[PDB]
Ligand binder design. Structure first.
Ligand code: HEM
Ligand SMILES: c1ccc2[nH]cnc2c1
Length: 289
């Protein structure tokens, strides 16, 4: 199963920068969403969920085919809430209908990370929409009520190692859980890309509690929460070392996240030898927009 990147006909860096800018401007405009968090976090989660269906063993799933647009994937219980991200991206797609669905979903995550003052995430175009029967079945995204061993094994399927896993989980500094979506009770939330997930894990006074959906979660006196899979990163000695590293080195975290997140978004894609180099988009701020 080979998915070869194919650049949208006639498109170059400037075309994609325009798409980035449209997403970025809408992010700024639609600021009231989810109690003033805005759509950044849900767009990062969307980019991850469209990518996290990948299976290294047979190259099924992954971002390439844009298959989240189809009902089977769109209605995955693991994707509850992501319809908000899809609806946010709808007018962007209508404006720039030349871009593939995989490219738009993945670019949405990149743009969200950067606009939320995260690292630059190099991004490559050329994902090609594939037909409805290429949609992966539900059940490939991870459970949150599990331990470090489950997290480690799960991420092997996505060819991610311990450092990559701990780095990617740092995205949980963004946004919040919603009881109605996932059965987890939201805590204190923000919409700035930082290493604060790791600081919270290490510095907070955590207590294990059972929420109103009957799921266990870790809650702090300060009003923050962690999923059991989040908290596993301080229960496992290997994960713990890396949590400490990122809590104490913002730059290292930024750089490692950027690599891991680009890799997540590119898993399953074969880039031809003469494909364009990855693009690094300018933020609205860098452009004076
Ligand atoms: C073991 C791995 C993971 C599990 C079990 C997990 C689970 C969850 C759950 C249950 C939520 C709450 C959904 C809701 O109620 O709306 C959530 C939110 C989120 N997740 Fe993860 N996640 C994992 C890995 C990741 C990774 C790798 C990324 C990105 C790199 C990510 C980004 C997010 C973001 C940005 C949100 C907030 C969405 C919002 O505010 O609407 N997650 N995740
Ligand atoms: C999802 C969203 C926000 C979070 N904060 C801590 N764990 C999280 C999971």
């Amino acid at each position: 199963l080979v998915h070869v990147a194919s650049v949208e006909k006639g498109r170059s860096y400037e075309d994609f920068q325009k798409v980035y800018n449209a997403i970025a401007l809408k992010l700024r405009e639609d600021d009231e969403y989810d109690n003033y968090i805005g759509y950044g976090p849900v767009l990062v989660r969307l980019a991850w969920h469209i990518s996290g269906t990948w299976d290294k063993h047979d190259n099924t799933g992954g971002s390439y085919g844009g298959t989240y647009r189809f009902k089977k994937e769109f209605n995955d219980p693991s994707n509850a809430g992501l319809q908000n991200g899809f609806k946010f991206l709808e007018p962007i797609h209508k404006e720039f209908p030349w871009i593939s669905s995989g490219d738009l979903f993945s670019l949405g995550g990149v743009t969200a990370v950067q606009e939320m003052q995260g690292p630059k995430i190099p991004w490559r175009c050329g994902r090609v929409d594939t037909p409805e029967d290429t949609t992966p079945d539900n059940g490939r995204l991870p459970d949150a009520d599990k331990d470090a061993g489950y997290v480690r094994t799960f991420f092997q399927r996505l060819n991610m190692n311990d450092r990559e896993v701990v780095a990617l989980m740092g995205a949980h500094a963004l946004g919040k859980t919603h009881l109605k979506n996932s059965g987890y009770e939201g805590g204190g939330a923000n919409n700035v890309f930082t290493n604060e997930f790791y600081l919270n894990l290490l510095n907070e006074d955590w207590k294990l509690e059972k929420n109103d959906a009957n799921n266990e979660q870790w809650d702090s006196k300060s009003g923050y929460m962690m999923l059991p899979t989040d908290y596993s990163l301080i229960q496992d000695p290997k994960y713990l070392s890396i949590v400490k590293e990122y809590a104490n080195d913002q730059d290292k975290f930024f750089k490692d996240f950027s690599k891991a997140f680009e890799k997540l978004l590119e898993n399953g894609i074969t880039f031809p030898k003469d494909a364009p180099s990855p693009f690094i988009f300018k933020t609205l701020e860098e452009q004076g927009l």
